[PDB]
Amino acid sequence: STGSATTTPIDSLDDAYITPVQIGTPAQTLNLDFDTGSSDLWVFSSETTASEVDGQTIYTPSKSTTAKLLSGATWSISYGDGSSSSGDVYTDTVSVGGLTVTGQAVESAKKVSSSFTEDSTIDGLLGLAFSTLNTVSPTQQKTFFDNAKASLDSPVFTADLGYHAPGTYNFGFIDTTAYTGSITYTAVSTKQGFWEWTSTGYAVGSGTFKSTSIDGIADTGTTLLYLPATVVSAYWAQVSGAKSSSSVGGYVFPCSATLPSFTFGVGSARIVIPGDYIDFGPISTGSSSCFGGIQSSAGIGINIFGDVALKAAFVVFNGATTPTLGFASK
Ligand SMILES: COC(=O)COc1cccc(CN)c1
Ligand SMILES: COC(=O)COc1cccc(CN)c1
């Protein structure tokens, strides 16, 4: 089997991407944030505290003839940005782009943190990291991809995120028309539950490539590119007037600037992020100070190849017995 679904930016900045997902019978379609950095499929629901729902579409398990409460199961998750959610668990039929999994754990939120409530466009998350990170207790549950894998034509999914435009998540096949050149594959460590890999270096604009190992995770659920402070300083030094602002929380730059590109290495291959992809717009409405899309990871504990980086590539998440990642230009 295969599946193919369009993923759409939630706003004009590409702050996140939403993909329609069919849950239950008859189907209830919710727009979920596909997140290769986490492993829970959770949704706003008829059980979510009413004051914490503000425009989201909810899953109502009592209206699904295939929903079954997973007795005794609860979940609770905290994300790297400080947001969180928790609740109980159903199993139900879940379909993405024509690919169907029966008995998928659908984690129904009883509580969500303010950042989720305040984003009316995201109805939940669909985790695509390794199932070892799933938070369901006392019986950990499998991700959608893990449940589907054995049925897929090939045990892979691909992320093709657009810049200020829709893109595609495919399951079970590699669309050879969706990229240019070749796909370069690179080793993955699953020891932390992530799609963790080592980039071979970077360049700023037309500058020389610096060969250096940068370990990080391929994370579709993170907006920005978080890299070591040395790398980030080298980038922003090429933007006149750019500075790190403690009050804003990262590098900012004059909105009048033209940003240089940023290149990262995948083996001997090179992925070029155009400068425009690094502009996240005014820090507050009407400001002439703009927020940068490349930020230091120093306070995180891990480097993160988030959407800023991934949207410059066609990315293969290869879930073979020994997983690997593939990157192609497009
Ligand atoms: C440092 O991370 C960011 O700035 C990500 O910003 C957003 C992430 C998701 C949604 C929105 C707005 N609904 C903003
Ligand atoms: C704005 O959001 C972030 O910066 C995310 O931070 C992370 C920190 C550690 C691990 C992960 C991936 N589970 C994400």
Swiss-Prot record:
Enzyme class: hydrolase
Keywords associated with the record: Aspartyl protease, Disulfide bond, Hydrolase, Protease, Signal, Zymogen
One GO term (biological process): proteolysis
Top-rank taxon: Eukaryota
Domain called Peptidase A1: residue spans: 17-328
The keyword 4Fe-4S is assigned to this record: no
Record-annotated disulphide pairs: 255-290
Keyword rRNA-binding annotated: no
Catalytic activity: Hydrolysis of proteins with specificity similar to that of pepsin A, prefers hydrophobic residues at P1 and P1', but does not cleave 14-Ala-|-Leu-15 in the B chain of insulin or Z-Glu-Tyr. Clots milk
Family: Belongs to the peptidase A1 family.
Protein name per Swiss-Prot or TrEMBL: Endothiapepsin
